[PDB]
């Protein structure tokens, strides 16, 4: 198995425009999102068939409660943070969650939360505490960390209750996270070489360029991973052509266990 | 899911007790023990949900994730002990699945 | 910083009698549930209140409705008493729900028995 992750978000506005949710929470496997909820609709949904396909009335209604709880939860500790920052205005607090199966079948999992869309405290579960970025961060930081049986009830859920999860959405989601569709790679020139990927999955794909067979990535533009919307990515990379020089260059690509050459005549 | 533990035990005064609890449940997000007197409410004593032992005067709670175990144990056992004691574990789902609880009884 | 008061503490009823349970806690928990305790068996969750303005069944809601009536208080409703309800009932409350070690804070309990 390639690499796959579990990562669930959760987003609150202090002071929204009308009609704009107070809170938001959202689940991912790798780039595909699996779950929604948020203050206006109050209902956990699906947002992948595979997962709709797979969990019965029960979970939908259950986490539902639970969000409901945490959606308040959420609340009242981003009007503490904005009380202790003493901040005027909307302001944001964001959570992270999440662990990782990697293709060598160890394990990483992480929690952190963010204000303002800044790093605000970072969970290390080896040590059980949390860090802390600012003085603000250090007063949570005290009272969270009192309460040492949350942070054992967290690290066994990063390391072993997500990683769970995963591997039971994995399975739901196989047809779709576990398949593979190579790219289709072509060059042109508009002065510099342009390298373009289109039609790939998973998205995780490597361009660059070679000159003579080194790679100066000091030299190279490289150009995003991009949703094509059909489920499949596109990506390119350029490099500037040396007119005063004849050099070979070639672009490589590597995707999903294959490496892929096309040198520039 | 069920969680088992002995209807009742009998101990001496002054003795020590240790007072069993497995569970099969749908993942697992932590195991309480709770006291309860005849005739009165439930009162938190322990929560376990790394393995090893955790000491609380003269109580001390151990957890064996592998295992699927827990056990209570009560050392310098004194009439006051007598009491039922509830073993309770949270599923993936936060649900609390309650042991049917174990009454012990204490010989003077 | 009563805890969890709940009343009556002993209520005798006939078949068919309607019956309210009154819970409150003064400990600004968010989280508030009812369970019974009959013979031979663990607790069983009746409804539960993962936080103000939201209730839901537990695995025993047949016979049964709750009011999350405000923060501090949580009423459980026999709208038709059965001899199966005979039992005793607990309201407890927890700081939140949705996280593993928070523990649970009990009443004093109300023993019911319904009668033909």
């Known amino acids: 198995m390639r690499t796959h992750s579990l990562r669930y978000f959760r987003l609150g506005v202090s002071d929204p425009i009308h009609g704009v949710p107070e809170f938001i929470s959202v689940g991912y496997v790798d780039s595909h999102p699996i779950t929604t909820y948020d203050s206006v609709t109050r209902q956990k949904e699906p947002r992948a068939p595979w997962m709709a396909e797979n969990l019965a009335p029960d979970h939908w209604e259950r986490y539902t409660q639970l969000l409901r709880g945490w959606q308040q939860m959420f609340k009242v500790e981003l009007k503490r943070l904005q009380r202790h920052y003493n901040h005027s205005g909307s302001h944001t607090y964001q959570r992270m969650i999440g662990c990782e199966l990697l293709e060598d079948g160890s394990t990483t999992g992480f929690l952190q939360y963010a204000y303002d869309g800044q790093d605000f405290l970072i969970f290390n579960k080896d040590t059980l505490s949390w860090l802390a970025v600012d003085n603000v961060a250090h007063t949570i930081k005290q009272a969270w960390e009192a309460n040492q049986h949350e942070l054992l009830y967290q690290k066994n859920w990063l390391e072993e209750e997500c990683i769970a999860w995963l591997k039971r959405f994995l399975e739901y989601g196989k047809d779709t996270l576990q398949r593979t569709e190579p790219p289709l790679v072509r060059v042109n020139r508009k002065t510099a070489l342009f390298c373009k990927a289109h039609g790939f999955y998973p998205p995780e794909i490597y361009m660059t360029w070679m000159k003579n067979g080194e790679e100066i990535v000091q030299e190279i533009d490289y150009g995003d991973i991009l949703p094509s919307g059909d489920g499949t990515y596109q990506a390119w990379a350029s490099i500037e052509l040396d007119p005063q020089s004849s050099n070979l260059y070639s672009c490589h690509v590597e995707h999903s266990g294959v490496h892929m050459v096309l040198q520039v005549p | 899911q069920n969680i088992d533990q002995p209807t009742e035990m009998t101990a001496t005064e002054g003795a020590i007790v240790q007072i069993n609890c497995t569970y099969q449940?749908?993942?697992?997000?932590?195991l309480f023990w709770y006291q309860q007197h005849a005739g009165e409410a439930p009162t938190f004593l322990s929560y376990?949900?790394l393995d090893g032992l955790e000491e609380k005067g003269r109580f001390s709670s151990f957890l064996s994730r592998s295992k699927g175990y827990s056990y209570l144990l009560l050392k310098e056992l004194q009439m006051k002990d007598s009491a039922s004691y509830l073993c309770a574990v949270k599923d993936s789902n936060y649900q609390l699945i309650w042991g049917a609880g174990t009454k012990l009884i204490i010989k003077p | 910083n009563a805890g969890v008061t709940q009343t009556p503490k002993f209520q005798v009823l006939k078949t068919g009698q309607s019956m309210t349970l009154q819970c409150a806690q003064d400990?600004?928990?968010?989280?508030m549930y009812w369970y019974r305790q009959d013979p031979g068996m663990g607790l069983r969750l009746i409804y539960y209140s993962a936080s103000e303005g939201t209730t839901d069944k537990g695995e025993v809601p047949n016979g049964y409705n709750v009011s999350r009536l405000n923060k501090r208080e949580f009423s459980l409703r026999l709208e038709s008493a059965a001899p199966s309800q005979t039992s005793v009932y607990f309201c407890?409350?927890?700081?939140?729900?949705?996280?593993?070690?928070?523990?649970?804070?009990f009443g004093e309990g109300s023993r019911l028995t319904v009668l033909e």
């Open positions: 407890a409350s927890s700081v939140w729900t949705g996280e593993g070690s928070g523990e649970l804070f």
């Open positions: 449940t749908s993942g697992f997000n932590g």
């Open positions: 400990m600004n928990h968010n989280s």
């Open positions: 376990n949900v």
